[PDB]
Amino acid sequence: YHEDRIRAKFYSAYGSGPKAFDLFNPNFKSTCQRFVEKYIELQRLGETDEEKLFVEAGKALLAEGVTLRRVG
């Protein structure tokens, strides 16, 4: 899907999210899913540049109170 193209950027930059995956929960939403949920709406907000769609969602994830570990 198109979400995988953003999940690849998330797993390349931050790796695995802080909240571990819970495969038992059917409606479980991970940090990468929150990142792509922010990305799909920042795409609707009229933005085309990938940096302007990526680092702004990376900063918008701090609004909820989660941590992001950029793998150097």
Partner 1 sequence: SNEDLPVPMENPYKEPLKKCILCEKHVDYKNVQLLSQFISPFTGCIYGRHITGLCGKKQKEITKAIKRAQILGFMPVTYKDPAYLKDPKVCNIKYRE
Partner 2 sequence: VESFASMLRHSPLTQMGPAKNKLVIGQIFHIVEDDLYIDFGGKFHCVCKRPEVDGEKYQKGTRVRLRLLDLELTSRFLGATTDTTILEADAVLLGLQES
DSSP state of 62: G
- C-beta of 34 vs 53, nearer to partner 2: 34
# residues contacting partner 2 (CB under 8 A): 21
Residue 24: name its binding partner from partner 1, partner 2, none (Cβ under 5 to 8 Å by kind): partner 2
The answer to whether the CB of 64 falls within 8 A of the CB of 37 is: no
The 12-51 contact track toward partner 2, x by CB under 8 A, reads ---xxx--xxxxxxx-xxx-xx------------------
From the number of C-beta atoms within 10 Å of its C-beta (0-12, 13-18, 19+), residue 19 rates as middle
